[PDB]
């Protein structure tokens, strides 16, 4: 991994780039002939928002996603993993993947409400005051429709709107 | 993925390959310079100054120049042909006036090139420009070869010249 460092010594600015050692892929994948990382490690339709050990492999230390041209995922798996990382960040997993603000960490605010499988952003959804009748019911979306192809061991489909 | 669908060569890339081959085969001085983004009026001015000394500039796509270069005997020019490129092509390599006219523009750096199958850097080009003419050096090689016999004759004739100079200084003393 490359790091950009700045040195200030008497109105002289030195910008330097330092390369450190990075971990590599595990030596024995279960499906070596697969072109995609997930689809060759056999994690397709297997991960979720809880699998932080997989979602944290390719994200920036400030919680941002990594480009597909650099990672190598197929487009659908990239979108799925992006939505899963969003849902994990909203649910509260990956707490060390946030920027450190020493000036903003002191003014504590209202306690964080616990949530999970959050599809939209908490600051953009409006409360459903009408809620509809039985025939026209305003259903509340839960989870993402991109994870509708995951393996269902119980056989029942996932209720994406409830 | 399925096997490779081999892409077929077209007339444009054939023309480009043939032109690059003709350039690398016919002329002698092949200088590589960085294609700097200047005003087209200044580009035309440099083109005029180049055609004054009968040297031309060419621009070829990397996609057709890199494979030809790594297939030919010019594989040592690969670190030069990555970014923007300018091929200074000329018969009768005369680097003196070339470096003279390139010195006027400060931020147009000479990358390198080849002088008669001799790959040189900027310092090599400067040294070749400062080097005398081929006629001068081939006339001076004969002198440097016969210099041994010349100094032998001078040192065998210096013995009477020593006494001669002794007599001259003794005369000049008074």
């Amino acid at each position: 991994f490359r790091e950009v460092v700045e040195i200030l010594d008497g109105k002289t600015t030195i910008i330097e780039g330092r390369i450190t050692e990075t971990p590599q892929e595990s030596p024995n994948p279960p499906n070596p002939t697969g072109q995609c990382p997930i689809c060759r490690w056999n994690l397709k339709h297997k991960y979720n928002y809880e699998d932080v050990l997989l979602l944290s492999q390719f994200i920036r230390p400030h919680g941002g996603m990594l480009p597909r041209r650099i990672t190598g995922l197929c487009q659908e798996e990239h979108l799925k993993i992006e939505e899963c990382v969003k849902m994990a960040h909203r649910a509260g997993l990956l707490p060390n993947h946030r920027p450190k603000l020493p000036e903003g960490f002191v003014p504590k605010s209202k306690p964080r409400l616990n949530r999970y499988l959050t599809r939209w952003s908490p600051r953009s959804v409006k409360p459903i005051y009408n809620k509809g009748h039985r025939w026209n019911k305003v259903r509340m979306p839960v989870g993402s429709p991109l994870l509708k192809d995951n393996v269902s061991y119980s056989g029942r489909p996932l209720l994406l709107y409830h | 993925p399925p096997p490779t669908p081999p892409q077929e060569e077209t007339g444009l890339v054939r023309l480009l390959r043939r032109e690059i081959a003709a350039v690398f085969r016919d002329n002698r001085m092949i200088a590589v310079c960085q294609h700097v983004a200047l005003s087209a009026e200044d580009k035309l001015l440099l083109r005029h100054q180049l055609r004054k000394h009968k040297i031309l500039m060419k621009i070829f796509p990397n996609q057709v120049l890199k494979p030809f270069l790594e297939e030919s005997k010019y594989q040592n020019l690969l670190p030069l042909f990555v970014g923007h490129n300018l091929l200074l092509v000329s018969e009768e390599p005369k680097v003196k006036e070339m470096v003279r006219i390139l010195k006027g523009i400060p931020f147009l750096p000479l990358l390198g090139g080849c002088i008669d199958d001799t790959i040189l850097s900027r310092q090599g080009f400067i040294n070749y420009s400062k080097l005398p003419s081929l006629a001068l050096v081939q006339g001076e090689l004969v002198g440097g070869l016969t210099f041994l016999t010349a100094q032998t004759y001078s040192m065998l004739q210096h013995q009477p010249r020593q006494l001669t100079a002794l007599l001259d200084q003794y005369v000049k003393q008074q």
């Binding site: - | 077209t10 444009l12 890339v13 796509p61 990397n62 996609q63 057709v64």
Partner: protein, 222 residues
Amino acid sequence: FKTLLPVPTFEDVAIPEKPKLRFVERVPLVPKVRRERKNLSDIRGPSTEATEFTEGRFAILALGGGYLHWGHFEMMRLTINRSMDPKNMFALWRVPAPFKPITRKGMGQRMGGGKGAIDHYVTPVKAGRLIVEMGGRCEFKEVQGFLDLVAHKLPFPAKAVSRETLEKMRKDQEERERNNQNPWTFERIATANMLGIRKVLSPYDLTHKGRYWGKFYTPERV
């Protein structure tokens, strides 16, 4: 660096005289004096006429059924004439002039008393029929761009198709209807009268195969 591809050249196409769309009359030269019933079968079902290209290369395809009257005709004519190039493009109709009389009654009239009075004329259009057909030495991108407006302003759903796009969509429909996975199809069940479904179905459903419902047409319904 990108390769230089050749451009399509049109020399065999001939632009005929009067390439613009001709004016259509609101009422035919001989008005129908006898009032006719509103047969909705001229809207129901698939189109049998004007389903293929005659001389042009692009057209406006109707994915549903409806009525075209003088307002629609004038809209299409004006838009196409003002957005076309008469030196390189020509257009022609594929639907006749409004001929079917539509009767109306005054406001405040009670039910009964007889038939109303002929208000205006319409042109019945079924699903899958071409409305305007264009050709010339032009490409499809510009024609599609300026024909999507007319296709949207038409009553029924419509698309700006060409020969290639029409054949592509028909072959795609064939591929879907041939590689469908579930063994139960509307055509099979209706033809075999499985579960006694003919009691709720219609005698025209045996030919519509569940793709046409009234005046609407669902092209993704096999």
